[PDB]
Amino acid sequence: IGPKRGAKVKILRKESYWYKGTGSVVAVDQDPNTRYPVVVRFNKVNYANVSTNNYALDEIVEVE
Amino acid sequence: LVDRDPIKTSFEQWAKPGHFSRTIAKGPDTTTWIWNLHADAHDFDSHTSDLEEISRKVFSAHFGQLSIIFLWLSGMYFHGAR
Amino acid sequence: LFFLGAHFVWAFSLMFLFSGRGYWQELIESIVWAHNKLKVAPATQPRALSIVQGRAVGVTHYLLGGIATTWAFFLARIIAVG
Amino acid sequence: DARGSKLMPDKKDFGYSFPCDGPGRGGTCDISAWDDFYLAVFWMLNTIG
Amino acid sequence: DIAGLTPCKESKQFAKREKQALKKLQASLKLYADDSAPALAIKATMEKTKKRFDNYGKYGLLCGSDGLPHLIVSGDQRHWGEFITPGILFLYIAGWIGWVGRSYLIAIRDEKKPTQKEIIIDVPLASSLLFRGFSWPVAAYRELLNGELVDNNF
Amino acid sequence: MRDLKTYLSVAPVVSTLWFGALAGLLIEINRFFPDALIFPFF
Amino acid sequence: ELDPNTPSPIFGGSTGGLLRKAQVEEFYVITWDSPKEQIFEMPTGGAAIMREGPNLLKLARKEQCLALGTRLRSKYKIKYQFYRVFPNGEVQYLHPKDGVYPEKVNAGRQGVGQNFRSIGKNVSPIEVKFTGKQPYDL
Amino acid sequence: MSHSVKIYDTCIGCTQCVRACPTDVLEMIPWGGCKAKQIASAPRTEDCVGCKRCESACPTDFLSVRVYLWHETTRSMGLAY
Ligand code: CLA
Ligand code: CLA
Ligand code: CLA
Ligand code: CLA
Ligand SMILES: CC1=C(/C=C/C(C)=C/C=C/C(C)=C\C=C\C=C(C)\C=C\C=C(C)\C=C\C2=C(C)CCCC2(C)C)C(C)(C)CCC1
Ligand SMILES: CC1=C(/C=C/C(C)=C/C=C\C(C)=C\C=C\C=C(C)/C=C/C=C(C)/C=C/C2=C(C)CCCC2(C)C)C(C)(C)CCC1
Ligand SMILES: CC1=C(C/C=C(\C)CCC[C@H](C)CCC[C@@H](C)CCCC(C)C)C(=O)c2ccccc2C1=O
Ligand code: SF4
Ligand code: SF4
Q1: Domain range for residue E127?
Q2: Do D and H count as touching (3 or more CB pairs closer than 8 A)?
Q3: Topology of F1-42 in CATH?
Q4: CB atoms H66 and D24 under 8 Å
């Protein structure tokens, strides 16, 4: 803490069910290492019984 | 489930979000389930694995109908008398 | 005065009987969109009919439609001459 | 959206007549731009009536 | 006045409608309640549609042919409140259906989890919200255009 | 017993004591003025 | 078929199971381990008792063996084999090949996944209209 | 294509997730890590029919999957026979 990890993130791949609606982050990766880190969550559910899905730093874009 | 099992609540559950199949109605919201449940209010896959009661439920539902015909048709017989 | 409705309800069944499902979804969102702009929808994820529910709302209507049609057609040709 | 939407993001490279898809997601059906054309032709047979 | 023939003051075709029809529903010579206390064609059902009369009100009211009334609703002559009078009324009532729609809704999403409050309904009709709707003067009619729901909320 | 900032709940269809009734009181205005099709004012 | 009875697995008769084009195409028999003799569900409306082995009944089409399999591992055991027979023996050898129980690694085989590009924005349409210069055939 | 319905996701982990499907899928290939790191959309698919039982369970997080080969076998049909 003292930069920010999971405050609030919009989503913009334009497949994501949530897409824009901007909700919940979670334990986003501490690596240099891959291309699909970041969990996120929001309550607006989605098309499957369970959705909370993981998204990566491209782009991915704002808040701001 | 556990609002609170067995021995120690008389206290009824009305509330906390309610029931079926184990990833039970989510918490998180949907419409379909309001259509589920009128449908397949009894199927008897669920409520218990073990027939146990149900025969102990279907005798009661039967009673309700016999009354009801009766509520009926008093009505009818009324109507017919007065 | 029934014979038109229920001779309508039937000819409403086909809509429920003859149609897709992610269709009224695909539609239900355009809706859900317009809804969010004014801030008036999301909570209780509004969802289209449960493939087989849609069939449940065929059939059932196709019958209480196509049937009372004659329940009318009949009581109307024995009351009065016959 | 013959190009397609949320319930289908993909729905493409056959855009038109791919009629049907698997059950699950919400339950998915006459959601090809053909089956809306398919669905359309009932009201063109109801107006034009 | 505008084409369908004119009001009550004369609409013969209309007159003929008054008369045959109801007056015959009469024309069951009797069917007998010479005292009798129940059967009510007799009194009103006619008379309640019947002591409709060279009066109805008066109401103007256009009476096409067959002397059934047609409603122009122009802003003229007699006819203004066959749409506006009961038009703004429709508007006012609705919108205070949904002003509170956009209310026993924008009051939750909040605190500790609100995932289906909505299917039981604390307080019913919101009520509290309810009266907001008559106590709209202006209400949305400026606040919707500025602030709150505001273009940003757009 | 209910003061300020929303109150107690209610069931699935209290709409069936809202279609029936409230709305019901309205026939009750459609016989007081047994008729409409325009209306005088007050 | 008397002069050779090889049989391990025990129906009696049914209307069910394979009719002629299993001979003219591709054959599809499944085989297994067993403990002590039990009475089973089938494909094809039902049922039989097993004992032992080869324990090598043959089925119509591949969906049917695997289908027991679910069938066969509730009520358990490890060991189920399903092979594909022709008329004319081999190629396409079906459960034998490496390991079994998909959900392990030795190797890749297979699959890719992506074609040329990944899931993201095919909002982009199909492109050049089929010519035999550009990599559109895999 | 001759069976091309994308169920891919990102985790391609398969524990309390998805297995269901008559033969078609051997996966568990790994790809050089993803958490659980069993990846890909598929094993070689010229074997079985066209379910979407393929998701129904364990994410695809774009498209569902479905009918579409077109180019259609008999063995891939169910009926020849
Ligand atoms: C003596 C037997 C009787 C009994 C005791 C049962 C009992 C049962 N049936 Mg059943 N059934 C019966 C006769 C009976 N059935 C008959 C004659 C048929 C042929 C039509 C069926 C067809 C049937 C099906 C397809 C199913 C069942 C299922 C069930 C189970 C689910 C019950 C439920 O949730 O209610 C369901 C009732 C509703 C959800 C109420 C909706 C009723 C609508 C359609 C209204 C009907 C039209 C009417 C004119 C509307 C009122 C007027 C209106 C216009 C104002 C239950 C164990 C279900 C199951 O899954 O098994 C476990 C399955 O759905 N039944
Ligand atoms: C929304 C649609 C549009 C409309 C307005 C209609 C309307 C109609 N179609 Mg129709 N149709 C359409 C699109 C439409 N269609 C399309 C796209 C197709 C496919 C091409 C069809 C295929 C079709 C067929 C095959 C038929 C119709 C028929 C009908 C008519 C039935 C007669 C009637 O209603 O008398 C009007 C009078 C009344 C409704 C009086 C109502 C009084 C009663 C019901 C009481 C008051 C209501 C109360 C709430 C009911 C009690 C319920 C209570 C328990 C709450 C009706 C005019 C049928 C017909 O009659 O001839 C073709 C015929 O079956 N349609
Ligand atoms: C009270 C309302 C709420 C509000 C503010 C709106 C508002 C809107 N709806 Mg809508 N809708 C609602 C509930 C609401 N809806 C419900 C419950 C349904 C059933 C699924 C729909 C089904 C629906 C469809 C199909 C469409 C709309 C559309 C619209 C938009 C066009 C207005 C119109 O002509 O539709 C008139 C409104 C209706 C037909 C809705 C009827 C239900 C109302 C009477 C709910 C009444 C309040 C309810 C009892 C809440 C309880 C009160 C609570 C606080 C205690 C507008 C933004 C249209 C659109 O997308 O274009 C922008 C589209 O046509 N709605
Ligand atoms: C443009 C419109 C139109 C349409 C779409 C309809 C549609 C309908 N009418 Mg209808 N009708 C119309 C114009 C129309 N009508 C007109 C102008 C009139 C004159 C007033 C009527 C007078 C009328 C009456 C009196 C009745 C209907 C009924 C019906 C309904 C029966 C159809 C059905 O659902 O089962 C399909 C029906 C059948 C397969 C059986 C009917 C065929 C009969 C006539 C002869 C075949 C029997 C023969 C011995 C061999 C049997 C073969 C067997 C395998 C079926 C249907 C909703 C009736 C109803 O309630 O039906 C249940 C009621 O009988 N209509
Ligand atoms: C005079 C007159 C007229 C005229 C008309 C016109 C000219 C038209 C138009 C109109 C229009 C042009 C419309 C539109 C507008 C726009 C808009 C934009 C609107 C809006 C709105 C909204 C948004 C709403 C909302 C709400 C409310 C208010 C209620 C509750 C909530 C809600 C959400 C529902 C007519 C014809 C009638 C006839 C005669 C009379
Ligand atoms: C505007 C509006 C509206 C609308 C209305 C309408 C337009 C209607 C209609 C309707 C129609 C158009 C039709 C319907 C019909 C219905 C029905 C029909 C119901 C029921 C039934 C019954 C009760 C039956 C019985 C029976 C039996 C016993 C069995 C078989 C036979 C019979 C069927 C007889 C309302 C007011 C609502 C709301 C508000 C808005
Ligand atoms: C038309 C149609 C729909 C669309 C039909 C829908 C969305 C019907 C559901 C509408 C509900 C009943 C409206 C409920 C809203 C009110 C109950 C809420 C307010 C409460 C009141 C006081 C009015 C399908 O979902 C479908 C699914 C599968 C096969 C065919 C079809 C099909 O033909
Ligand atoms: S179903 Fe999806 S998430 Fe599950 S293992 Fe396969 S690819 Fe991964
Ligand atoms: S149903 Fe789909 S996923 Fe399953 S094996 Fe067949 S093609 Fe593969």
Answers
A1: 1-154
A2: yes
A3: 1.20.5
A4: no
